Design a protein around this nucleic acid. Structure first.
Ligand SMILES: [Zn+2]
Ligand SMILES: [Zn+2]
Ligand SMILES: [Zn+2]
Lengths: 59, 59, 115, 47, 105, 258, 71, 66
RNA sequence: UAACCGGAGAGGGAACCCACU
């Protein structure tokens, strides 16, 4: 879809400040596989904020 | 790795506590399990009662 | 992988009530308070405070499962006293006593420190 | 324009390996060699 | 990776939903263009570890993490084997807090 | 039908432990304070670690775990911060967190003790306990190995994780001589005397006292450095009193709405 | 071409060069190559042992002294 | 592998005592008199330092570079 | 007096040692 496969950061609610990669997103929720714990939780898609992981200067 | 001191076992990325005694065959450590058997060259008088024989001097 | 997150013992979900009163039907004047996201810390002081009330005929608390964070407090009083006000008065004075214990611990500190 | 950099075993020198290359170190000659850490976001819960 | 036959050959390569025909429902961009996941990358069950294609256009032939295994990639090494083929070993680590059901003697 | 009037008597107060005696209270109130010392007293502890380069021999999570267990002096901050989950911000704030930073590279020839001296805070008041006695070893690096990370400390209590547990050990005790026979010794003389036993060396246990309740609960609260041992107490009394006030508000809403 | 002006005991080639120098000494029936190899090997052993004690100069040196004395 | 930060049972910080305790044993203290000169009373906290085996000193022998 | 896209369960067999209740 659109944000499936991107690194997000949960920014509200009980998992605040927790990083993971989105596995499956729908119009409302998303399944984030958390980076520290060994678990995939299902968070609301508005509690998320994309963080991205890129490199500049490519030369 | 023989008669080799302890800095050098560690310089080759090894442990000085490894006992040895095993083979590497296609990158697997294999051990040869010791198999027992009967002593050869020795006379043993048994008695099988489940046959036609009273006694038997194997060798 | 089936481990519950540890904030689940004190954080209330969405829709859960803290406390929930249910009239009990077997005996007259008995209620059941069901506190969510609590344990023996809060359930034991209230019960022992309710047993000091002379108008309380039964008080107890249980924790139905330890993997779940909920206690039940069953109170039965005498007919001129609802268990709604037994449970309220058992908290008001438990508060008044903890506040007084705090004042006294504080003056005993500042007298021990140089005194 | 990232050439897939490896670290040698015995040398500890970064090499550039593109595809269709022999895996050997640019010096000393070593056939074992490892990859570098990721650049993504590693965040742990000190937990 | 190997020489399977005249027309058949394996190679470490990110598959693409364009040429690799057999291909999984997975996230292939976790692995970088070398076709190998890099150390420090969180994985889970049936995430692609070593991207691999075998030519027929290309079939997908890649290796995946064992279902419900869930680690972080520890280190990746690349080398050649006696036949002189590229050969890699990835190891994946997984921290295990003592939860209930675990056996203690 | 009413409250009791407890009295307190501090017998020893150092900067590492307090011994007090509480009299005239119920056993349930005295034990529930003991539990509030251990779980519900807020404290600052590292809880978010972003590792930029780790080449030590320890893991990535082994470092982060050993960093969460480093006690940070929370003493007047901890009551001004907010919980992270309640800060109306995005990505930690100075008003709900404290930021740390470790950057170490071993260049010399000897091994490097990465200790908690290297954790540099951005607030001068929340520091690891180094103020006024060695430091908590985090790793040991060799020549060429390094560690850069930044970490964040937020507020929490020992009911979520033990890292937010402000005490070394709470020593509760009541009735030192078996006056209530709450415990029943099969041979009462093989038992050593309590520290608080007002008993001679002749007799073994106090004679049975039939009508009698516990009072005089003896406590010995020992801090781990993070809060001062009399602030653990004053905070457990306020934390308990606040659990009760919140329960009472939710109760009055349940009552009026039925 | 890189090994030519680059020294062989720098850095991790130390042990491998030690065994290979012993192999080069053993492969030779000429006494001159054996004595040159013995001198090079003793010099490399001393340099490596000095480098090894300097790194173990701190905090491993301290636990060796405690174990030696605890037994 | 490396000294735990806290005593598992108690909560007390024992992470800063491994060097001090190996230094006292190097001095001359007996092992039981070193453990209370450091201030470890409960036997819960005392087994952290007696039983600890330090492996990171052996793991540091495997240098990545130099 | 106007407005660009549509494809989906894939997939594997034989033999041997170790271990668990
Ligand atoms: Zn090479
Ligand atoms: Zn904030
Ligand atoms: Zn302890």
């Amino acid at each position: 879809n659109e944000l499936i496969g991107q690194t997000v950061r949960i920014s509200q609610g009980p998992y605040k400040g927790y990083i993971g990669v989105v596995k499956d997103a729908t119009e409302s929720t998303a399944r984030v596989e958390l980076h520290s714990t060994c678990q995939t939780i299902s968070v609301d898609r508005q509690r998320l904020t994309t963080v991205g992981s890129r490199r500049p200067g490519g030369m | 790795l023989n008669g080799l001191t302890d800095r050098d076992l560690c310089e080759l990325n090894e442990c000085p506590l490894d006992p040895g005694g095993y083979f590497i065959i296609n990158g697997s450590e294999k051990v040869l399990i010791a198999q027992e058997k009967m002593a050869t060259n020795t006379v043993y008088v048994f008695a099988k009662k489940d046959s036609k024989y009273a006694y038997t001097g194997e060798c | 992988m089936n481990a519950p997150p540890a904030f689940e013992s004190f954080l209330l979900f969405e829709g859960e009530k803290k406390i929930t009163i249910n009239k009990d039907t077997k005996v007259p004047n008995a209620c059941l308070f069901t506190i969510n996201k609590e344990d023996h810390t809060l359930g034991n002081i209230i019960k022992s405070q309710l047993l000091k009330d002379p108008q309380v005929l039964f008080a107890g608390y249980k924790v139905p499962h330890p993997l779940e964070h909920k206690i039940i407090i069953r109170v039965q009083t005498t007919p001129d006293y609802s268990p709604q006000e037994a449970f309220t008065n058992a908290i008001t004075d438990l508060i008044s006593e903890l506040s007084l214990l705090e004042e006294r611990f504080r003056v005993a500190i500042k007298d021990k420190q140089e005194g | 324009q990232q050439p897939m950099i490896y670290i040698c075993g015995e040398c500890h020198t970064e090499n550039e390996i593109k595809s269709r290359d022999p895996i050997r170190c640019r010096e000393c000659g070593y056939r074992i060699m490892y990859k570098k850490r990721t650049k993504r976001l590693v965040v742990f819960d000190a937990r | 990776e190997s020489k399977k036959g005249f027309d058949q050959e394996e190679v470490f390569e990110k598959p693409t939903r364009e040429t690799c025909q057999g291909m999984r429902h997975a996230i292939y961009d976790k692995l970088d263009d070398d076709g190998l996941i890099a150390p420090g990358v969180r994985v889970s069950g049936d995430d692609v570890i070593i991207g691999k294609t075998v030519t027929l256009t290309k079939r997908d032939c890649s290796t995946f993490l064992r279902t419900s295994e869930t680690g972080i990639v520890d280190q990746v090494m690349v080398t050649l084997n006696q036949e002189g083929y590229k050969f890699c070993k990835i190891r994946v680590r997984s921290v295990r807090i003592p939860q209930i059901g675990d056996k203690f003697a | 039908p009413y409250a009791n009037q407890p009295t307190v008597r501090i017998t020893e107060l150092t900067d590492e432990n307090v011994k007090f005696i509480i009299e005239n209270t119920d056993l349930a109130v005295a034990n529930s304070i003991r539990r509030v010392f251990i779980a519900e007293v807020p404290i600052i502890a590292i809880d978010w670690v972003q590792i930029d380069a780790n080449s030590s021999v320890l893991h990535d999570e082994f470092i982060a775990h050993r960093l969460g267990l480093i006690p940070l002096t929370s003493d007047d901050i901890v009551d001004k911060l907010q919980y992270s989950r309640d800060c109306t911000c995005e990505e930690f704030c100075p008003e709900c967190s404290v930021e740390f930073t470790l950057d170490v590279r071993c260049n010399e020839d000897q091994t490097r003790h990465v200790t908690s001296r290297d954790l540099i805070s951005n607030s001068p008041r929340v520091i690891p306990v180094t103020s006024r006695q060695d430091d908590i070893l985090i790793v040991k690096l060799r020549k060429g190995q390094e560690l850069r990370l930044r970490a964040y400390a937020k507020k929490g209590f020992g009911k979520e994780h033990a890292k937010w547990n402000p005490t070394a050990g709470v020593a509760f005790e009541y009735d030192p001589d078996n006056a209530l026979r709450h415990t029943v010794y099969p041979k009462p003389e093989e038992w050593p005397k309590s520290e608080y036993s007002e008993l001679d060396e002749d007799e073994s246990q106090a004679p049975y006292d039939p009508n009698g309740k516990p009072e005089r609960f003896y406590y010995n609260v020992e801090s781990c450095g993070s809060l001062r041992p009399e602030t653990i107490v004053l905070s457990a009394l306020s934390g308990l009193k606040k659990k009760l006030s919140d329960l009472q508000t939710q109760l009055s809403h349940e009552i009026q709405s039925d | 071409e890189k090994e030519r002006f680059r020294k062989a005991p720098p850095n991790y080639a130390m042990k491998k060069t030690q065994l290979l120098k012993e192999k080069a000494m053993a492969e030779d029936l000429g006494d001159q190559d054996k004595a040159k190899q013995i001198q090079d090997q003793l010099n490399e052993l001393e340099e490596r042992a000095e480098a090894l004690d300097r790194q173990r100069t701190k905090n491993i040196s301290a636990i060796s002294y405690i174990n030696q004395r605890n037994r | 592998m490396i000294i735990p930060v806290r005593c598992f049972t108690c909560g007390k910080i024992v992470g800063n005592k491994w060097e001090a305790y190996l230094g006292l044993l190097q001095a001359e203290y007996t092992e039981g008199d070193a453990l209370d000169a450091l201030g470890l009373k409960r036997y819960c906290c005392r087994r952290m330092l007696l039983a600890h085996v330090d492996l990171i000193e052996k793991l540091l022998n495997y240098a990545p570079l130099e």
